[PDB]
Design a protein around this nucleic acid. Structure first.
Ligand SMILES: [Mg+2]
Ligand SMILES: [Mg+2]
Length: 342
DNA sequence: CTAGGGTCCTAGGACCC
DNA sequence: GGTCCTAGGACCCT
């Protein structure tokens, strides 16, 4: 009863798109991210910039210290969305068992496929080749019997490569696999796990499930399972969006309600435009606001509400402004909507 | 020197039983 | 003892 799961993942997605559309950027260090003056961070960088240590989520001031010639780009999201739609249509030529995880990646369950003699290895190769042929972008891929191992595997031979993990290979692969490589085990969990001698899946295998449950709740069951190659999550092609948000970090902290209200007046039309694409009548389940203070604490307050409404969002921001906050400066203002259930 | 787009999980009190 | 409301936080993607 062994499934074949492919994880396909575009290489340096945003930057790869900018280099295709402007070949001058191919061999110099580039990165999509907000300027140092906008207090921005790097969304991604090409390999010439990664050589200097430039990484996704790095504050753009640090990126520029490591790489003084870094060329900064704003991002062309319609171009990325277009390439996203294209590769998903390419996925559809091979199976309908497609679960996109983001613009540039997806799981595919090809267990019941009879393309390429039912070979998941050759399906993954054909997909990567077609993507390059039709979009002039490269992709990497991972092949394994379960989701999380396939996703790990797509990182191991990138860029423009793939890696295959068979059932026979799973135990050796797991023994020294660092826990932090598991999707969903992040910095905080890894440091907790490290703090009591759990670094790798092999370490967790020597652990009692009851103790893992007591100490991490349902997460501890996930840890126990993944450390054994257990991952029964099915590829789900029916996931739907649940929220939409629009927020802006200012170049300078604001200290006056007049400034906050002005920001909201610019954000609201954008939130409405994006809601309207997916819900023309603007009917929703909840709406709310977000403030992030100069000390980086953030608060949200949101409530049942039937339909996008600017004045209520201003009103709610006013309360949050007055009630929470206590004289701090504000670096970010956000608006938020929770979508109806169906 | 710290984005903006999101998903999922937890947890207390309210409410319904 | 379920389920809803709400706030916060870890985590994911580029
Ligand atoms: Mg990628
Ligand atoms: Mg990806």
């Amino acid at each position: 009863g062994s499934r074949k799961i492919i994880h396909v993942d575009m290489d340096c997605f945003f930057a790869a798109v900018e280099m295709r559309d402007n070949p001058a950027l191919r061999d110099i260090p580039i990165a999509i991210g907000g300027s140092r003056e906008r207090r921005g961070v790097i969304s991604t960088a090409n390999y010439p910039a990664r050589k200097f240590g430039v990484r996704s989520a790095m504050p753009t001031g640090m990126a520029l210290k490591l790489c003084p010639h870094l060329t900064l780009l704003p991002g062309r999201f319609d171009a990325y969305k277009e390439a996203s739609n294209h590769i998903r249509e390419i996925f559809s030529r091979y199976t309908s068992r497609i679960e996109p995880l983001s613009l540039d990646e997806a799981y595919l369950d090809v267990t019941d496929s009879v393309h390429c003699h039912g070979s998941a290895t050759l399906i993954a190769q054909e997909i990567r080749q077609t993507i390059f042929n039709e979009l002039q972008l490269t992709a990497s891929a991972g092949v394994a019997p379960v989701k999380f191992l396939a996703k790990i595997a797509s990182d191991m031979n990138k860029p423009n490569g793939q890696f295959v993990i068979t059932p026979a290979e799973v135990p050796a692969f797991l023994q020294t696999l660092p826990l932090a490589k598991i999707p969903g085990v992040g910095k905080v969990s890894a440091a907790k796990l490290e703090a009591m001698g759990l670094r790798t899946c092999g370490d967790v295998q020597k652990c009692d499930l009851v103790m893992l449950l007591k100490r991490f709740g349902k997460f501890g069951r996930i840890l126990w399972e993944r450390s054994q190659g257990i991952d029964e999550r099915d590829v789900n092609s029916e996931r739907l969006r649940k929220s939409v948000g629009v927020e802006r970090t200012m170049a300078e902290d604001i200290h006056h309600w007049s400034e906050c209200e002005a920001i909201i007046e610019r954000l609201y039309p954008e939130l409405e435009r994006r809601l309207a694409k997916v819900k023309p009548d603007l009917l929703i389940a909840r709406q709310g606001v977000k403030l992030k203070f100069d000390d980086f604490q953030q608060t949200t307050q949101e409530h049942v509400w039937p339909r996008l409404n600017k004045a209520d969002l201003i009103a709610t921001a006013r309360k949050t402004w007055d009630e929470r906050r206590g004289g701090r400066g504000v670096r970010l203002v956000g608006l938020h909507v929770t979508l109806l259930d169906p």
